[PDB]
């Protein structure tokens, strides 16, 4: 007669169970029929960090299926713009043509994909509606004003290294209005595309189309969008007297804060969230009996890091909206019968 | 609208309305698993399970077997609605939290 409703207990030789006991018929009384108000009451989002290119909200009180749906949407279904075709007029570089096209596909563009649309199948030409064109034209020459020196930038250098700065947007249609001068640009100005020696030249036109990270990774808008369940650490016994420090070393260092309540030293669990699961207490043989570390049941921690095309919060919003769009597409196709 | 990027339903042996297999095209484990989680909350369904037919293909099979009365197409169309309601609520809550944090940080 003992219920544990909220944690995923764990030892070393394996974890105890894979359930969450929050579904219909999963208890004598604790049965579920998807009370929507109970959800709307027990759900809360807490946004910890939000630099540019980072977010770490909490998303407390949701199941693993919905959290995983959100994570898989950001990685593979939120749309981005990226180079699909490369027209090479001349290329006397050491970097091949196919390898140059590949390298150009993996460069992130700062166009927002919500103002564009998908190219129809076999729309090779493209129009202001679905495409953005950029041009890289660079040639390397020796600089006339150079002494007998060997630094590659000083001599043998007008364009020794071709960067993303060298790529220039060719406004395709009326896109010069709508897009102000600096808005459509590659996100990073320092990505090394190639290297040149005097007499070598690159000249090409790149076409960027819309697409999702599912049919090619180049179109994916986040470095990673993973999540982790909130750890839980409980001191079953008061640790003290120089075993507190050994305890504080078997964890990521901020988790167990050793206070000094009396002349003796007491270890306390200051911040369970910092913990990385390393299970190094389980090697102690005397303190594996003192601490129980498990996971909180439906308390997640998310971390979204965008490449630079869209801000992270906008990414999460568009992910939730893409899931809603899936649901609505299937609802309206069902209503079609 | 789309004759086959979307739904194809196969009523079972005897065309039992209470046992249907929906084929959802262009879907992977994301919608499959979230929709199966949302359809399991209905006390009127006795068996819900999804599965991907083959890696090379892009389509899932849901199987809903409901109790004696309802035609097993209401559980599906209600799991869809509840999942979309949950997404709308999560979106509202997340945007409100982001706004509140932006204000708290821009003030200080």
């Amino acid at each position: 007669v003992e219920e544990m409703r909220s944690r995923v207990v764990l030892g070393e030789f394996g974890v105890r169970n894979v359930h969450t006991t929050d579904f219909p018929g999963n208890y004598s009384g604790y049965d579920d029929a998807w009370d929507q108000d109970r959800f709307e009451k027990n759900f809360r989002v807490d946004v910890v960090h939000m630099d540019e290119n980072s977010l770490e909200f909490d998303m407390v009180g949701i199941d693993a299926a919905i959290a995983n749906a959100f994570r898989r949407i950001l990685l593979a279904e939120v749309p981005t713009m990226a180079v699909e075709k490369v027209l090479v007029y001349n290329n006397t570089s050491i970097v091949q043509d196919e390898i140059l096209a590949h390298r150009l596909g993996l460069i992130p563009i700062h166009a927002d994909p919500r103002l564009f649309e998908y190219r129809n199948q076999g729309d090779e030409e493209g129009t202001e509606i679905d495409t953005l064109q950029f041009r890289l034209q660079v040639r390397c020459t020796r600089n006339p004003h150079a002494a007998k020196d060997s630094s590659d930038p000083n001599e043998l250098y007008v364009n020794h290294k071709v960067y993303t700065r060298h790529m220039t947007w060719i406004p395709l249609g009326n896109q010069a209005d709508l897009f102000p001068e600096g808005t459509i640009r590659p996100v990073h100005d320092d990505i090394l595309i190639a290297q040149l020696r005097p007499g070598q030249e690159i000249d090409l036109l790149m076409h960027c189309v819309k697409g999702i990270g599912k049919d090619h990774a180049k179109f994916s808008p986040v470095a990673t969008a993973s999540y982790r369940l909130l750890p839980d650490i409980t001191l079953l016994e008061p640790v003290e007297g120089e075993a507190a420090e050994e305890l504080s070393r078997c964890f990521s260092p901020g988790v167990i804060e050793v206070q000094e309540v009396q002349g003796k030293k007491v270890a306390r669990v200051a911040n369970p969230r910092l913990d990385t699961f390393s299970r190094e207490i389980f090697r102690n043989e005397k303190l594996k009996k003192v601490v129980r570390l498990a996971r909180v049941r439906d308390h997640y921690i998310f971390s979204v890091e965008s490449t630079g095309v869209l801000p992270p919060d906008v990414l999460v919003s568009e992910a939730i909206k893409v899931l809603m769009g899936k649901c609505r597409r299937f609802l309206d196709e069902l209503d079609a019968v | 609208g789309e004759r086959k990027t979307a739904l194809e339903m196969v009523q079972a042996a005897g065309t039992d309305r209470h046992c249907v297999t929906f084929v959802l095209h262009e879907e992977d484990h994301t919608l499959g698993n979230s929709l199966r989680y949302m359809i399991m909350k209905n006390p009127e369904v006795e068996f819900c399970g999804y599965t991907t037919t083959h890696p090379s293909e892009s389509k899932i099979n849901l199987r809903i077997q409901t109790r004696g009365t309802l035609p097993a197409v209401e559980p599906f169309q209600r799991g869809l609605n509840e999942l979309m309601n949950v997404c709308q609520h999560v979106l509202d809550k997340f945007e409100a939290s982001i706004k509140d944090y932006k204000d708290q940080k821009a003030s200080r």
Partner: peptide
């Protein structure tokens, strides 16, 4: 580290 203060 710790949701917003």
């Amino acid at each position: 580290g710790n949701p917003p203060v």
